[PDB]
Amino acid sequence: MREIVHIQAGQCGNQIGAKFWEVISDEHGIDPSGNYVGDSDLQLERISVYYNEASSHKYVPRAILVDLEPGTMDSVRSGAFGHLFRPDNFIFGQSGAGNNWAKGHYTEGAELVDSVLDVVRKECENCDCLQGFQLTHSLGGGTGSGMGTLLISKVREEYPDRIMNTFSVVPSPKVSDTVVEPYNATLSIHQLVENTDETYCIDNEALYDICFRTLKLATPTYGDLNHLVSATMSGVTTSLRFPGQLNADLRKLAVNMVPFPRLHFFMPGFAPLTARGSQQYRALTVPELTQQMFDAKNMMAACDPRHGRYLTVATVFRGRMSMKEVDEQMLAIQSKNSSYFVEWIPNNVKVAVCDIPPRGLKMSSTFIGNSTAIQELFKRISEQFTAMFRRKAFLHWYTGEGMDEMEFTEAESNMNDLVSEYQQYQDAT
Amino acid sequence: MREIVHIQAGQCGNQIGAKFWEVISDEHGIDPSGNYVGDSDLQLERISVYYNEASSHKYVPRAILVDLEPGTMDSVRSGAFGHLFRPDNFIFGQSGAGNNWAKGHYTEGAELVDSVLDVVRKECENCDCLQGFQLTHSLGGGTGSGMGTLLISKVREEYPDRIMNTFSVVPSPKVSDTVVEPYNATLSIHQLVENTDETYCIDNEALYDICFRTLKLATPTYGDLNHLVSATMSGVTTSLRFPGQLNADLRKLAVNMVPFPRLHFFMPGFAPLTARGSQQYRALTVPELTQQMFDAKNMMAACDPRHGRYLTVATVFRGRMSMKEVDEQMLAIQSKNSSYFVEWIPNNVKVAVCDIPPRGLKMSSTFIGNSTAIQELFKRISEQFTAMFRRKAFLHWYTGEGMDEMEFTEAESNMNDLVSEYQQYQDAT
Amino acid sequence: MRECISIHVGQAGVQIGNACWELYCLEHGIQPDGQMPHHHDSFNTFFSETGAGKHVPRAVFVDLEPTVIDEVRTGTYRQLFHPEQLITGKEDAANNYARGHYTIGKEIIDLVLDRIRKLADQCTGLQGFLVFHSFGGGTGSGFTSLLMERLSVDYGKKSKLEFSIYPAPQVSTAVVEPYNSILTTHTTLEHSDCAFMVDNEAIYDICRRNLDIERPTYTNLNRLISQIVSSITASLRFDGALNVDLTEFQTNLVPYPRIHFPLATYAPVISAEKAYHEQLSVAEITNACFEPANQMVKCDPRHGKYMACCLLYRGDVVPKDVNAAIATIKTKRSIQFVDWCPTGFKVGINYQPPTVVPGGDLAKVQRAVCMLSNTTAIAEAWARLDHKFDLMYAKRAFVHWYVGEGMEEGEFSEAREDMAALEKDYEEVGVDSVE
Amino acid sequence: MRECISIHVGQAGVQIGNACWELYCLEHGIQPDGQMPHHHDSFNTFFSETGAGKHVPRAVFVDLEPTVIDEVRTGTYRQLFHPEQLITGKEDAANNYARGHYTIGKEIIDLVLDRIRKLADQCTGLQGFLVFHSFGGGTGSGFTSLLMERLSVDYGKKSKLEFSIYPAPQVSTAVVEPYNSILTTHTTLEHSDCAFMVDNEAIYDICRRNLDIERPTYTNLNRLISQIVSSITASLRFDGALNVDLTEFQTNLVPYPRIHFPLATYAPVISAEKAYHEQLSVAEITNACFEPANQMVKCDPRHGKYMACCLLYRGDVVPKDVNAAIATIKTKRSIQFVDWCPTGFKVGINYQPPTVVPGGDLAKVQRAVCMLSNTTAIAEAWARLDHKFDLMYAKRAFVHWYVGEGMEEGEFSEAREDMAALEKDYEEVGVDSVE
Ligand SMILES: Nc1nc2c(ncn2[C@@H]2O[C@H](COP(=O)(O)OP(=O)(O)OP(=O)(O)O)[C@@H](O)[C@H]2O)c(=O)[nH]1
Ligand SMILES: Nc1nc2c(ncn2[C@@H]2O[C@H](COP(=O)(O)OP(=O)(O)OP(=O)(O)O)[C@@H](O)[C@H]2O)c(=O)[nH]1
Ligand SMILES: Nc1nc2c(ncn2[C@@H]2O[C@H](COP(=O)(O)OP(=O)(O)O)[C@@H](O)[C@H]2O)c(=O)[nH]1
Ligand SMILES: Nc1nc2c(ncn2[C@@H]2O[C@H](COP(=O)(O)OP(=O)(O)O)[C@@H](O)[C@H]2O)c(=O)[nH]1
Ligand SMILES: [Mg+2]
Ligand SMILES: [Mg+2]
């Protein structure tokens, strides 16, 4: 019950999804062929939430892989853990978004969004009681941004009651992997703050920093970053895919973390993060995890929390632990950082506890902080957008697909309004 | 008991019949020599309905193969599964219809129709209790159209009580395999709406589309299309050739599907249709079949049902299943598509269930929809006919065989009246 | 049991027949002496069989000059033909229609008809006639007109197909081509079920451009036309997934009694060295067939409208691809059929691939397609001939030969009126309908 | 299923193509005859495949002088190309734009377009065009202008990439280079999506200093430009951790409709003996790419500002190092982008290392990086050409050839106005914004 549908847009979304399904299959003991070879019945007691039991006793992920260029699709298809996706799912086009948002939302996307929605509808009717949607996409790449926003708008039209999750890879502050990414970011954020329940902001910069310093890895390949994001997502969903002394569901997180309709952008975090050698020289206790999760050097979003306040915080543990210990740790961490939390939300730590470790550990933890610091991020992007709009640079590519300036004017105004709201609530009293 | 006589007119009819008898023999476990080597007595408990037990314990199909050119006849004769037809059946002429209807119904057909009727009469007297006739023919080719209409008229003269089935391959909308096919179609339809109980319209376009998209075949040879039509026919007859929890006969379908004497044109459909690879990644449940059977992309007639309403619908399942499941599925599908059914026919889904799968599978299903959408088809053809009659193009070939213009005038008026009736009942209230 | 005889009139017909029967004997594994060391019967439709393993063709080679027939009797194909059929006259018409239709041919027409009747009565499922005859030569025009009238008198309703050699617009070997053409057309217009326009100039062009041979002999043009004929008859002579008989041809490609002049086209035509470097898609070869540079009559199809088309494929062909290709062809605008014929195709598929004649020029292909297309562009061609006629009649040039050989000027005037009427009919059909 | 055809105009284009297709055939393990004894499909994007194991390139080699094309037909790469594509004229433009755009090329432009259309329709996911053409030669300038106008008319919205050979400031083999350059630029300014500036002088400099070869032939410059092209297309032709398609190129590197002249650069370029003695850090090779002595256009980047950059890496590359190196590059002051573009990079990573051509000059490396950079320094270069033009127009030198070959003086004046406008636009963009 409470089945979840997985959508993967853009190249980053698809790669993250490949690693994500690898992780999930490892969790439930699923062979690459798609048949169960596990050992613990609890794996199958909720196997339906992400998988569908196809006949002859096989399992197929409830995935809907979307793209506009067959390259990465075929890469996924050929590689291992690709032979179990249901082959009818791989929707792809030929033109390619060309790293443009106008193509990804108006011209090219309008031709595949119908087929995507049809497969979505088939999967929805297949499920018993739909729980919600999780969309894995970028914010820079044209396909990800444009087509994901279009799909979100259409789905919200057809399912205004379900819950919506997005794992959007926000552009990094220092580097810029693309050139027009401010435009894509602004338009995508406009659509998201329109029609999304929660948005898990991530930067590649923070993941680089974590893989470098904390994990002591000088050679971070994209496999590792995607592995980290996959572990975060698995930690988010294990609260319902598994039994727990204090269980959680996606709707619980949405209610707890989203005080106002618009302010629903979360920065995630994971713990423990130990190098290969520096592991046996540290104790794995709940206080250690809790103290690890609260610092700028372990936030997957490149913005110091100290510059603002945590509006709310959710914390999902795993593995066998003692509830009193967790409560004591949360009390201490809420006490000593009193200036780091908003005054008018007393007891602002949502807690959930699972019963199964994320495989290969004693106990883990996932942090989901809805703070005001992220305003800086938007601030940054907004400014960049403004600059690249003041000269109307690159404007012709977007204008040529039917979009016009007033779109950009409205989107920038909307983002500035959002930043104003974040600022207002940060200094509320 | 309830023996059925098979007639095959025109080249398409004969090829379809060859594949059809291959399928039936595979069903009953009949060797190519015509002797039974099966393993289940239920095969022989009703083997008489289509076969005759010839002496020395052999079986001969109750087939009557008709043509005007010995080419395809000899092709059938030489090929395997041809050595069991009774050789006296192969009636053929020498002139050939020349893709003309006037030849196929007035000049050339008048010389062989007598021998055909004589063999028909012999087979009828041979049977214990005749059930009905099934005619497999085209609508474009001259032999099929003309001679089949002539045979139907004569048989209806000599057996006004039996039931009449036709599998007429309607011309496709986009392509046109012949040049004068509007004339043949109009005249044949005139005769059919005169003297037929039911007519199973089929287009090659829809079969191409199914073999391309659904089956994922880029090389559809005519063998495959004929195989599909044969599977449909076998599914239609298995309701009486085999035991079933809720059995059906041809007369049952005729009564249920034909509310008015003229409006008896059905579009068929088959399910499941799975590619070679995409099979194990899908569950074979009654809901899956039912949802597959209702969509334009699986109707063997090239016309979207959504453009009109289903006047009536019949559904014949196979293999072991649960009746309650079927009832629930039909209820749901009648509920959600309320605008897709006619108001004044409550509970418009006839259901039948057999007990044997069509070999290799767990459960199959055959759909027989009598809708109003097919009017478009006739509309199309009518218009084409009108155009080719406005200039009187190709008129001399048909005039030279005794037929005159007033024939065409009356036939076109009759077809327009039929379309008017379909339109009237589509928007009835 | 569907027999079809071949009648070759004039030197052009006889040489084309040499090529055609070489091709057939190669197809069915038939030695030149009639012996033979997917097939069915197949050869029965064109080859009759005697007691021994010796088969003979159903051909009637008639000529008024014994030169070419003597070459046939002396060629490697000496043992093949039934020696009674090789009818030879004494003095050829010498490019004079009157001689070929009133004076000389009148004295062997009876023997030719007698041999025709013998061959017909020895058959059972006779389909129709294949007349291989030119248009400029005197024997061709005159004798063919006479023979067609006689056969139409005798065999009331049977297929009668001609393979005329339409006189080229600019290359003319004869000098009186307009006279012979106009007379033979005025005669055959009421008897021939379906002609088949082919020209030498277009075949020269095709041989130079596509096959990359700059110096072709008549052997090459003859081989190409033989390939076209073989593709026409492959339906009768072989097992195909969608067969078609000659009556279907005359029914499909002839909208009106008079307008029955479809032009031929064949594809693919590529040299052995260029055989690779292209996979030869069936859609590709369809496009090649519709390419205005590949037609075998010097007329741009874009100046007219395809009233009907008939594409006969052979080899490893799959119907879905044919349907897709024809749909695409119908989509394009430069190929514009008449409004009143919305269905402008007959399709036929055969299982036997074309066979390449050793010592030939083409390359072994797996798929082939012959298009027989009845269009309106050909009408303009008549105008040209008409024009020529007018000039050569304005001075009464060359008239004395025809006058003194059993014909009158009023006949010339009447034939001119008839050609004008045909051109008028083509123009009238070319227009669109109202309402 | 993302196809991209190549069009080589003029002798420069044809020789560069010789090098490029040698490189490709080496990359995918393709024998010269199209046979083949991390890879996927890969080669499908540039190689079409026939029934046998023979693949053919999607190239259209067009020229007006048959010499170089004949060399191609006689070279070791004879069996490869589809012989129909090797279009040859009769009399070359002889370094005259008017001949190459009005008189001569006007008579084979139709055949070229026909072959283009055939190749396009045989493809399904056509990405765009690669025009390999010089700038000084008459055929290059004129024929390329004509062909670009025709394609832009035909294919409305598709990628069109050129690899021009910018005329050097001091080494000029031609004498009328300013005229051809100005005319072809005025024409192509409205049709080419993204050009690619490369010069021979800079490549001479690079070959002498870095590769330590003092006497290079055109073979070496061609090999270098082929390596650049291969690095551009490695994203389409291979599996990479961050791929990029040509539409992404035109979106990223083209801020305004007119300013679309990015210059190329490649690294590392080190001789085999100097292959050791350096570990070739990705940060090191990035610095090499930004070194003003390594650019392949004789323009000091320090005199302008990088409006955009696109770095395509290949081989054993790790994204964190790329991020660090680019951060460092952004830190330094001598590399000063425009204020209004704060994000001046597109990054692409491929998994396939560059492959060294046997008999070549470079050394087997594990990492490589091609930079396509759109800057403002190139503007000054236009000034130089403008200056030259002015002088050669102040005396009306050489004007009579162009006048008598289908062109007017008002056209020269208009092209001068257009070049002045482009220089004005470059200067206007180079300034900073207020408020
Ligand atoms: N295609 C083709 N045409 C030929 C060939 N040989 C002759 N012709 C045609 O024959 C025409 C000459 O007139 P013919 O019909 O041959 O005259 P004939 O057959 O000798 O009979 P007479 O007119 O009485 O001499 C020329 O226009 C040629 O086009 C050939 O080998 N192939
Ligand atoms: N990089 C490079 N450039 C070349 C090569 N060969 C010729 N060129 C360039 O070609 C220019 C000469 O004009 P071309 O474009 O070759 O003239 P063309 O291609 O022969 O055509 P026409 O002008 O009609 O003769 C010179 O400026 C060279 O820079 C080569 O092998 N490599
Ligand atoms: N975390 C992560 N991000 C990626 C990965 N690959 C690409 N990205 C990000 O995705 C963005 C590119 O979007 P992409 O999907 O490739 O372009 P699109 O085809 O237009 O959607 C860049 O900003 C990258 O930062 C990956 O493996 N991991
Ligand atoms: N479904 C199907 N239709 C066919 C096949 N062969 C021919 N047809 C159809 O039959 C028609 C030709 O009729 P045909 O019997 O060959 O001509 P006839 O001899 O005058 O009756 C065409 O419109 C084809 O669409 C086949 O194998 N399968
Ligand atoms: Mg003669
Ligand atoms: Mg040149």
Residue numbers in the entry:
A (entry chain D), B (entry chain B): 1 to 429
C (entry chain A), D (entry chain C): 1 to 37, 40 to 42, 47 to 441
What do the authors report?
pmcMicrotubules (MTs) for m by self-assembly of GTP-bound αβ-tubulin heterodimers into a cylinder consisting of laterally associated linear protofilaments (pfs). During incorporation into the MT lattice, GTP hydrolysis is triggered by the catalytic glutamate in α-tubulin (E254), which becomes juxtaposed to the GTP in β-tubulin at the longitudinal interface between dimers. GTP hydrolysis has a destabilizing effect on the MT structure, and polymerization can only continue in the presence of a GTP-tubulin cap at the growing end of the MT. Here, in order to better understand the GTP conformation of MTs, we used cryo-EM to visualize MTs assembled from recombinant wild-type (wt) and mutant human tubulin in which the catalytic glutamate in α-tubulin was mutated to alanine or asparagine (E254A or E254N, respectively), making them deficient in GTP hydrolysis.
We first determined the cryo-EM structure of MTs polymerized from recombinant wt human tubulin to 3.8-Å resolution. Lattice parameters of these MTs, both undecorated and decorated with kinesin-1 motor domains, were nearly indistinguishable from previously reported GDP-MT structures assembled from mammalian brain tubulin. The dimer rise was 81.69 Å and 81.50 Å and the twist was +0.09° and +0.05, respectively, for recombinant wt human GDP-MTs and GDP-MTs from mammalian brain tubulin. However, there was additional density in the recombinant MT structure corresponding to the internal His6-tag located within the partly disordered acetylation loop of α-tubulin that includes lysine 40. This purification tag has previously been shown to have no effect on polymerization dynamics, and our current study confirms that it also does not alter lattice parameters compared to the endogenous wt mammalian MTs studied previously. By calculating displacement values between a symmetrized and an asymmetric (C1) reconstruction, we previously found that in mammalian brain GDP-MTs, the pfs at the seam break cylindrical symmetry and appear separated with respect to the rest (we see the same for recombinant, wt MTs), while this characteristic is either missing or less pronounced in the case of MTs containing nonhydrolyzable GTP analogs. The more-symmetric pf arrangement around the MT axis observed for the E254N and E254A mutant,and for GMPCPP-MTs is associated with the more-stable GTP region of MTs. On the other hand, the outward rotation of the seam-proximal pfs in GDP-MTs, both for the wt MTs described here and the previously described porcine MTs, may reflect tension buildup at the seam resulting from GTP hydrolysis.
